[PDB]
A paper describes a structure:
In order to elucidate the molecular mechanism that regulates LapD function, we determined the crystal structure of the intracellular module of P. fluorescens LapD, comprising a HAMP–GGDEF domain linker segment and the degenerate GGDEF–EAL domain module (LapDdual; residues 220–648). The structure of LapDdual (space group P32, one molecule in the asymmetric unit) was solved by single-wavelength anomalous dispersion phasing using selenomethione-substituted protein crystals. We also obtained a second crystal form involving different crystal packing contacts (space group I23, one molecule in the asymmetric unit), yet the overall structure of LapDdual in the two crystals is identical (root mean square deviation [rmsd] of 0.9 Å over all atoms; Figure S2A and S2C). In both cases, the biologically significant unit was predicted to be a monomer, based on energetic and geometric estimations. LapDdual adopts a compact, bilobal conformation. The GGDEF domain, comprising the N-terminal lobe, caps the dinucleotide-binding pocket of the EAL domain, which forms the C-terminal lobe of the tandem domain structure. The EAL domain buttresses the N-terminal S helix via predominantly hydrophobic interactions, burying 1,170 Å2. In addition to the S helix–EAL domain interaction, the GGDEF domain contacts the dinucleotide-binding surface of the EAL domain at multiple points, forming a loosely packed interface that buries 1,620 Å2 of surface area. One such contact, the salt bridge between an arginine residue (R450) and a glutamate residue (E262), forms a particularly close interaction. While E262 directly occupies the dinucleotide-binding site, the loop itself is located at its periphery, partially blocking access of c-di-GMP to the EAL domain. In summary, the structural analysis of the cytoplasmic domain of LapD reveals that in the absence of c-di-GMP, the protein resides in a conformation incompatible with dinucleotide binding, with the GGDEF domain restricting access of c-di-GMP to the EAL domain.
Numbering used by the authors: 219 to 399, 407 to 648
């Protein structure tokens, strides 16, 4: 659509102008902070992990002794070297940002300290190449601080740990890095291998309603809750990253799909359900899934699968996945969508039930222009292709009225019910 194509550049220009640091291409502090604030809040995204704070040694000195232009060039030079080291860790993806000239950060949710230690050294070792290069004249180049943050730690709290690490690193004339101070690594292992075998995850449901008619329910997202010794539940956030460090994620989709598939034959409502990259990465349990889908031909209409915008395979494959699905009469959509159209290309070609907007963009839309603006930009470019839009993490009576002003299709979030277990 010659139309779509204009509105999908106009929307991506508007991402970059808003959330992209122009120099390095990395996220701006604004975006970054929106993520931290928005992740801690979210039971399914939080929050064990690590924080990287890097400050470059002697900004001022560098500017005098080398002048602004060759200084700017330098931070480009590190943006890169940061990304390069942070590739190995996917969770970090999209979370590498530059706060202030000379200072950058990476949120690495669900990161092992040992991983952190290794990351710092590799990064530190890699960072020095710049000095030799002639890029900087300070040999130590930059200071590296890694703060470990527990989940349930407020973002402000999380940042504060980071400042200490950087400072700790700074007060060290031997090395340039540091990290503050499992567990337990094997307890999680055993607890999880176990619960999977024993089919011991519960099915939680969150309502998704029409934005126009709040009373009108489009579908219930099925979230996951791990059980523990006392049938207490544990939320996707805490445990998910542990499935990954262990490779058991596909195990879960497979389970959580057998359970949904049965339970749906208890009623007639419409559901929605995650589908990991790790089930798509593997071709063995991936295909399992279609077979499960094939047997239950009947419910394809009532079920809808959901990938994270980050977890996408190649548009080439995606086309394959979206199609092979439609054949089974089942629907597909995207979640944690953040306007990276350039990545999809073939979107209008896919035939998605909808896109669920990462909700990091929703919180305080009424009150925060740049967000409201960026989304208006998006609905417009997905209106054209009659691809419905759903907002996650709507909590406030206000945020809602702004979406009705925006004419999005639908809403999900604390405002319409936390996730619970109704059938």
């Amino acid at each position: 659509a010659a139309l779509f194509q204009e509105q999908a550049e106009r929307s991506e220009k508007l991402r970059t102008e808003s959330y992209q640091d122009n120099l390095t291409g990395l996220a701006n502090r604004r975006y970054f902070e929106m993520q931290l604030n928005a992740r801690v809040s979210n039971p399914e995204q939080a929050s064990s992990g690590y924080l990287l704070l890097l400050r470059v040694k002697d900004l001022a000195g560098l500017n005098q002794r080398l002048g602004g232009q060759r200084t700017d060039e330098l931070l480009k030079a590190v943006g890169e070297q940061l990304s390069r080291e942070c590739a190995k860790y996917p969770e970090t993806q999209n979370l590498v940002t530059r706060i202030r000239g000379g200072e950058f950060a990476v949120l690495a949710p669900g990161m092992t300290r040992e991983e952190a230690l290794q990351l710092a050294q590799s990064l530190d070792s890699a960072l020095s190449s710049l000095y030799a290069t002639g890029a900087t004249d300070v040999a130590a180049v930059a200071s590296i601080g890694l703060a470990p943050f527990a989940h349930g730690d407020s973002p402000q709290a999380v940042l504060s740990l980071g400042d200490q690490a950087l400072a700790q690193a700074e007060g060290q004339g031997e090395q340039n890095w540091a990290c503050l101070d499992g567990d337990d690594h094997h307890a999680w292992h055993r607890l999880l291998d176990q619960a999977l075998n024993q089919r011991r995850f519960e099915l939680f449901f969150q309502p998704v309603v029409a934005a126009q008619d709040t009373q009108l329910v489009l579908h219930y997202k099925v979230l996951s809750r791990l059980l523990d010794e006392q049938g207490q539940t544990i939320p996707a956030g805490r445990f998910l990253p542990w499935l990954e460090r262990f490779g058991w994620t596909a195990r879960l989709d497979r389970l959580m799909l057998e359970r949904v598939l049965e339970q749906m034959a208890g009623h007639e409502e419409s559901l929605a359900l995650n589908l990991s990259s790790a089930t798509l990465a593997d071709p063995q349990a991936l295909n399992k899934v279609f077979e499960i889908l094939r047997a239950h031909s009947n419910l394809g209409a009532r079920l809808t699968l959901e990938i994270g915008e980050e977890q996408l395979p190649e548009q080439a494959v995606l086309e394959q996945l979206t199609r092979r699905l439609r054949e089974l009469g089942f629907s597909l959509s995207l979640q944690r969508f953040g306007g990276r159209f350039s990545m999809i290309g073939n979107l209008a070609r896919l035939g998605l039930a909808y896109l669920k907007i990462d909700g990091s963009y929703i919180r305080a839309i009424d009150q925060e222009s740049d967000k409201r603006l960026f989304i208006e930009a998006i609905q417009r470019a997905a209106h054209s292709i009659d691809l419905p839009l759903i907002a996650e993490r709507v909590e406030t009576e206000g945020e809602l009225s702004v979406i009705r002003e925006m004419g999005l299709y639908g809403v999900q979030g604390q405002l319409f019910g936390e996730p619970k277990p109704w059938g």
